[PDB]
Amino acid sequence: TPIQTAVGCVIGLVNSSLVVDDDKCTLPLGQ
Amino acid sequence: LRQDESVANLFANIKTQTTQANGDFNLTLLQVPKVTTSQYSYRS
Ligand SMILES: *[C@@H]1O[C@H](CO)[C@@H](O)[C@H](O)[C@H]1NC(C)=O
Numbered sequence: 001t002p003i004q005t006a007v008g009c010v011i012g013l014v015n016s017s018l019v020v021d022d023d024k025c026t027l028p029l030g031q
Numbered sequence: 032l033r034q035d036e037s038v039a040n041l042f043a044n045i046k047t048q049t050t051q052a053n054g055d056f057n058l059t060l061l062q063v064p065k066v067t068t069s070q071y072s073y074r075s
């Protein structure tokens with residue numbers, strides 16, 4: 001199921017309401 | 032990728048460890064307004 005993000009809507013990612021911080025976020029994905 | 036790394040390094044460098052929660056100095060321009068006229072909640 002595709003989901004709508006702030007960098008365009010993506011296919012293959014799940015939305016789990018998980019929050020990471022800086023200096024642990026690889027694949028910064030834009031925004 | 033180098034631009035993203037430089038931006039991350041800058042915003043990690045300008046961070047502060049400890050903060051505090053005015054006097055007769057009027058600092059309403061520097062702080063967040065009470066009623067937001069913008070779509071960003073943290074913009075001054
Ligand atoms: C993930 O789901 C929650 C609850 O359905 C929603 O509030 C949130 O906006 C979703 N994430 C994104 C990036 O839209």
Ligand SMILES: *[C@@H]1O[C@H](CO)[C@@H](O)[C@H](O)[C@H]1NC(C)=O
Nearest residue numbers: 054055056057058059060061
């Ligand atoms: C500080 O300046 C703003 C500028 O518009 C003004 O609205 C506000 O009343 C001032 N604060 C005081 C305490 O005078």
